[PDB]
């Protein structure tokens, strides 16, 4: 189960645009061994998806909700349920536009 890959969706609210949030997110995902993507939304949020083994996944989720991201002020982080997936669908972690 420790080499199983799990997946979740996320959306982060607060002062999360105009503060390099996406670059920070990409850096932290990649250094935690988490794949996925994120984007700035028309709602003034950052949304995306993660894929990783459970341990790595939950570390990334912690970082997204712990509110110690430089220059960002996170008012809340929303997540989907966790699902197991057969294999990674993403090669890495990408910022979308």
Curated annotation (Swiss-Prot):
Give the annotated active site. 22, 40
Give the organism, scientific name.
Answer: Drosophila melanogaster
| SUPFAM superfamilies linked | Acylphosphatase/BLUF domain-like
Return the protein name.
Acylphosphatase-2
UniProt enzyme class: hydrolase
State the family named in the UniProt similarity comment for this chain.
Belongs to the acylphosphatase family.
Instruction: Enumerate the catalysed reactions.
Output: an acyl phosphate + H2O = a carboxylate + phosphate + H(+)
The UniProt record lists the EC number as: 3.6.1.7
Q: Which UniProt keywords apply?
A: Hydrolase
């Amino acid at each position: 189960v420790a080499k199983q890959i799990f997946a979740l969706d996320f959306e982060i609210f607060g002062r999360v645009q105009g503060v390099f949030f996406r670059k920070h997110t990409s850096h932290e995902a990649k250094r935690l061994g988490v794949r996925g993507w994120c984007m700035n939304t028309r709602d003034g949020t950052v949304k995306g998806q993660l894929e990783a083994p459970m341990m790595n996944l939950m570390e990334m989720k912690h970082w997204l909700e712990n509110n110690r991201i430089p220059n960002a002020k996170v008012s809340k982080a929303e997540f989907s349920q966790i699902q197991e997936i057969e294999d990674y669908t993403f090669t890495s972690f990408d910022i979308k536009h």
